[PDB]
Amino acid sequence: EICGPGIDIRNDYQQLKRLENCTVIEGYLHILLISKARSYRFPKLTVITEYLLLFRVAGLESLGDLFPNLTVIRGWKLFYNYALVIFEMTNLKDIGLYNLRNITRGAIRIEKNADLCYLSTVDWSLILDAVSNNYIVGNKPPKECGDLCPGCEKTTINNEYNYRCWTTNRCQKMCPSTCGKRACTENNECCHPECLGSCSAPDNDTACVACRHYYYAGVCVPACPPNTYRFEGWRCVDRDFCANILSAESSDSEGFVIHDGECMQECPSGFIRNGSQSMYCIPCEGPCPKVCEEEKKTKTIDSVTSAQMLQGCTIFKGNLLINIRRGNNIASELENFMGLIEVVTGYVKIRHSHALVSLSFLKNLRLILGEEQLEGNYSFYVLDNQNLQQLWDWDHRNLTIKAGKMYFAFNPKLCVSEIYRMEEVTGTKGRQSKGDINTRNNGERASCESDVLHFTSTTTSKNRIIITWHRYRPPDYRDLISFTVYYKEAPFKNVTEYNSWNMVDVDLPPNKDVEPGILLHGLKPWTQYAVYVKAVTLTMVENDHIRGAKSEILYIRTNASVPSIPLDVLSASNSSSQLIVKWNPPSLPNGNLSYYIVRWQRQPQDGYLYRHNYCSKDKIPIRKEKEEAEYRKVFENFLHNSIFVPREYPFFESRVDNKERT
């Protein structure tokens, strides 16, 4: 009688009756918030896969009162690396599991049991493996307990040797030395190697309380027979069993898969279901496609959590509604979730997305169908995006809208030419109406074609950079002109335009012979900075030809300086006449490390020592809130005024060209 896949008994103490017939509990067992008010005893139960949890059970004095024959807790799935949790159990006096033999996986958590004795009387080192990670705190103090086994055997705990027992009447059962890793019957006759725990009969597959590997047809097999597959982690089932198993109900819930001789819930990472919902997984090349299916026909992306549900999807069976008013780093965060979406079965609506200046986060999206379209047969519908400068329609990208039209309205920063280039790749030239794309309220503030600002001279220090660009006469004589310098620390050159950019506004100088420049204040020595200037053309006469000026992203690295001292010098001696020494690279290298230079000087044997008469002494010497980081910083600042130019006891000098060890 297998019970599962999870027993959760709580509140009602009579609800414990669900264990009348269970001999094995497939899955965890929860006995919580029970208030006992005749007793209940379950000698049928012997094995529990996964873990066992007990919490706030009043009236229960010993665990032997419930599960006396419990032998193996497999711990296939653990409660936070714990296979047995006994927490806040009142009236409990001892762990009465006197038939417990092997806990295959996980640790034990025994906490807050003011009456729990017989803890030190149990040698947990022979029933489980990871005894180091066990948690036994807050129980009855051993000083005020009084553990006394009836009157059995005993063994060594640390350097101590004391008796072992589970309760006041039963002792801790052990196996003789001759069986080794094997198991033993109550009468100390070795159990079949594939057995585990006890035996109904010595050396027999069909006489086992619990198998150590797997189970099938009453036999403890090492591996499952050829036509059976591993289910959970203890028994073998046939193929027709897993064709009837159904996972937890979800939007895309399906049956179980057969893979690598195991019957699991979903195909593992790097695998996809062969065919159409078949029982077997096939290796998928590179990235494995995850089609995402949702109950809501129109998924609305109005926050950052809503986008997390589309993480890793390749195809979307539904409609996408983007509505992003707020968000700083969402331009790169949406690309994490939606960057792999390639096909959309429905339509895409970009409404009120003021935070989006572009749609580049929708990478790999190359197909939009039109199974359902907005009123008026629209498959692409943007509206009221006060900052949408460009689409994701770079001339490198690919796109195909199968059916539907495109409507654009109230997008002022979007150049009207960009959406004409869209329907080229989209393939909907002439399919839209005359009002679907209008130059009114669209591209009103757009500055499409821009000029080029040319840098003229750059000068570098260890912390300052002077850069000057050419004077820029605006396209119209009456425009007021000003500049804006964008500079930010960029370790490498792949940089996106404005974002943690530092900005400063410098005006065009009055004298026409001097060109506009800017001086940067405090920069890190030897650090590559990305700089580009942008013009501010305030046109008194609006539109006609809105024309800005933008420069290329210039990468300027400051000079190098004196490096920092090496960090944490440690040294040891593995042999006489030899000294190993390791360290860490300095805090502020300020350039390429190139090499280290180490020096070792012999130290004189201590003064005096030769002088004292050590036959009179009794001991002769031998030899082998927290702002302290700011304190140590002061002493590192002192080491800048003194450097080292390389070339009684003499110094020996050697160069280490690569590693931090010598």
Epitope: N244, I245, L246, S247, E249, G275, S276
Partner: antibody
């Protein structure tokens, strides 16, 4: 083989009432096979409405019947149940119990339960 | 969306002894995940053909399935006086499970 599925008797109930249909398994391991439910009316003909896995207890419904049907199981009694609330004249049909197969095929079928909404 | 199974013709007037073939076409491609069922009058539908082609132990040799992909056919070599009923095809590759409208095999 001795496999058989016995469903509850016919029902004639007024509109707006809730009803549930039983289906007891026999001659086979009840926990080893899922149970499907199929609605056969005069219109739409055979309509699959849901399947329940007898092992774990999880279900999968047809979206046309999620807010209308509810499939439960009884491991001890070896019986599944198909609950139907706010019955309409449309739901007046014969419902069938199917098992001894898998989530893909319905090998054996029960005799059917006639629900008539007056 | 769902998968609709269109069974044509809706009714076949046959005399016992004639060989007939039923057809069940699908909207999307089903490859192999199609099954057949026979339902006589005042009975429950019983399985005839698993997975488009392979037959069931018990059903006579007259019933045979064919097709793979989007067009499937059920053949009956010499209809008997017992084979007069209504036949369905069952979709089985994508949720939800859907059936065909049904093809009545009545007496001509």
């Amino acid at each position: 083989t001795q496999v058989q599925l016995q469903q509850s008797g016919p029902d004639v109930v007024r509109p707006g009432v809730s009803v549930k249909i039983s289906c007891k398994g026999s001659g086979y391991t009840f926990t080893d096979y899922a149970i499907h439910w199929v609605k056969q009316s005069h219109a739409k003909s055979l309509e699959w409405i849901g399947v329940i896995s007898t092992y774990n207890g999880n279900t999968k419904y047809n979206q046309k019947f999620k807010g209308k049907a509810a499939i439960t199981v009884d491991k001890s009694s070896s019986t599944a149940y198909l609950e139907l609330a706010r019955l309409t004249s449309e739901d007046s049909a014969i419902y069938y119990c199917a098992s001894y197969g898998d989530l893909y095929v319905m090998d054996y079928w029960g005799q059917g339960t006639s629900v008539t909404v007056s | 969306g769902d998968i609709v199974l269109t069974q044509s013709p809706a009714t076949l007037s046959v005399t016992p002894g004639d060989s007939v073939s039923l057809s069940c076409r699908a909207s999307q491609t089903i490859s192999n995940n199609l099954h057949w069922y026979q339902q006589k009058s005042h009975e429950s539908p019983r399985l005839l053909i698993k997975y488009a082609s392979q037959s069931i132990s018990g059903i006579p040799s007259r019933f045979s399935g064919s097709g793979s992909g989007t067009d499937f056919t059920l053949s009956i070599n010499s209809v008997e006086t017992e084979d007069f009923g209504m036949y369905f095809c069952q979709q089985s590759n994508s949720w939800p499970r859907t059936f065909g409208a049904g093809t009545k095999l009545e007496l001509k």
